[PDB]
């Protein structure tokens, strides 16, 4: 009865909060009994190049401590040495009437490195960075009241700090990064080099003019993924060119991990930002290109989402298609062609519905003109979850359904296109 994680395949670093301590007082600095009217202080000074952290891993060969430290540096730029130069100190003055006790614990900041792949965590590592302590103050426990026998609470952690879960995706270090040194105008074609040689990789690039862009591979194959470099563009700038801040922290925008799904990305890109494009493993030596085209027409009504190209819609009956479901308020698009000859009068009754994830869908008629593609709305506010409503669509026409996931109940989304007549 856990929660569904709509994370794209990759590596993620999660800040789970601060103020963690071990059970059974394993991190208890100690307790001071300050008399009435007096003062007390607990100081935790630290040395240089010290302060051992706490590390566990599910796969030491892959998720080693060095690897986890490098990924943490990629995400938030943490280094163990930084915690070495810090000091913390708790000062408490007891009132005039009664005495006061202060307890001090050494705390930790809990980071988690996860390898998320197809809806599950295949590798998990826990890092605990030495933090700046936790202090609790009580009235003087009057000896003795009583002594009550209790049992240990077993191994575990207790968070005394505020709730926190900051998730940041990081660049896979084993995959190469190729740079487009020139800012992207209305049109460009990247020829994938032979240096990488079929291994999945990233493309770092920026944009000349803010706007909505269509990015695709040849025949929309393979599916591409796009990320935004977090905090990029505030630093060193050159007009019309790319400036790499070596930022590895990325935010997933859209893209399908499945390398076989025919898809193209429509995304709103900013000239003051840097973006990565992940292209997956290609199992052939056949050449391919990444095409970048700024869109000024109706295609801007698909941002930001990957549009899935359906080829097996050539007969009446039942068809359903499974993709990685986007997060809540995140879009996924399907472009399909009703079977039959297009004579502008033959119609087929179409039923569109999802199986588990509820989403609001808007479909568009697509009529490519000499000016480009024209998208015409023909329905809005379609609730796809177990939708029994049907609509008659022209045989041989082209339609694009954009679905916004409003309830995530499954890591996958299944769009069914039932065709009668």
């Amino acid at each position: 009865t856990q929660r569904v994680l709509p994370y794209s395949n990759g590596l993620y670093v999660i800040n789970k909060g601060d103020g963690y301590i071990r059970t059974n007082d394993k991190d208890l600095i100690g307790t001071l009994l300050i008399e009435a009217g007096s003062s007390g202080s607990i100081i935790q000074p630290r040395l240089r190049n010290t302060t051992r952290p706490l590390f566990t891993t599910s796969n030491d060969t892959k998720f080693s401590q060095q690897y986890t430290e490098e990924r943490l540096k990629d995400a938030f730029n943490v280094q163990l040495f930084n915690t070495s130069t810090s000091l913390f100190k708790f000062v408490e003055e007891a009132p005039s009437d009664k005495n006061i006790c202060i307890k001090a614990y050494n705390t930790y900041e809990k980071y988690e490195l996860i390898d998320y792949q197809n809806g599950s965590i295949v590798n998990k590592a826990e890092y605990y960075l030495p933090s700046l302590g936790y202090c609790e103050v009580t009235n003087a426990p009057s000896p003795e009241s009583e002594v009550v026998k209790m049992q240990v609470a077993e191994d575990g952690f207790i968070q005394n700090g505020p709730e926190e879960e900051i998730v940041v995706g990081v660049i896979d270090p084993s995959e190469n990064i190729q740079e487009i040194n020139t800012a992207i105008s209305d049109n460009y074609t990247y020829n994938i080099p032979g240096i990488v040689n079929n291994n999945p990789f990233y493309i770092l690039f920026t944009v000349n003019t803010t706007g909505i862009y269509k990015i695709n591979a040849q025949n929309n194959l393979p599916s591409l993924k796009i990320y935004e470099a977090i905090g990029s563009g505030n630093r060193n700038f050159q007009s019309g060119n790319l400036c790499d801040d070596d930022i590895k922290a990325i935010n997933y925008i859209t893209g399908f991990d499945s390398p076989n799904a025919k898809s193209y990305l429509v995304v709103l890109l900013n000239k003051d930002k840097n973006y990565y494009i992940r292209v997956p493993q290609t199992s052939s030596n056949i050449e391919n290109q990444i095409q970048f085209k700024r869109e000024e027409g109706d295609l801007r009504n698909l941002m930001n989402s990957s549009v899935n190209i359906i080829d097996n819609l050539n007969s009446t009956g039942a068809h359903y298609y499974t993709r990685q479901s986007p997060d809540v308020h995140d879009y996924i698009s399907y472009e399909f062609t009703i079977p039959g000859n297009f004579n502008n009068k033959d119609t087929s009754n179409i039923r569109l519905y999802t199986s588990y994830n509820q989403g609001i869908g808007t479909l568009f008629r697509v009529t490519e003109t000499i000016d480009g593609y024209n998208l015409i709305n023909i329905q809005q506010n379609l609730h796809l979850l177990n939708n029994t409503n049907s609509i008659r669509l022209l045989n041989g026409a082209i339609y694009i359904l954009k679905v916004e996931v409003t309830e995530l109940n499954n890591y996958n989304i299944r769009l069914h296109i039932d065709i009668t007549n």
Binding site: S39, S41, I43, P45, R46, L47, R48, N49, T50, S84, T85, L87, K89, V91, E93
Partner: protein, 48 residues
């Protein structure tokens, strides 16, 4: 010369010869809350 030719001592435990880490001690009670009013000393002072 023999008396003064001590072998070179190794640096701090974490590695280095440059500087200590410092630490704060003391307080003036109070109106004012003199909590940061205190003394500062190098922490190891002999780490070699």
């Amino acid at each position: 010369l023999i008396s003064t030719a001590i072998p070179f001592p190794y640096g701090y435990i974490g590695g280095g010869y440059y500087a200590p880490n410092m630490i704060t001690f003391g307080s003036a009670p109070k109106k004012k809350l003199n909590s940061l009013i205190s003394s500062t000393i190098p922490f190891p002072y002999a780490g070699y």
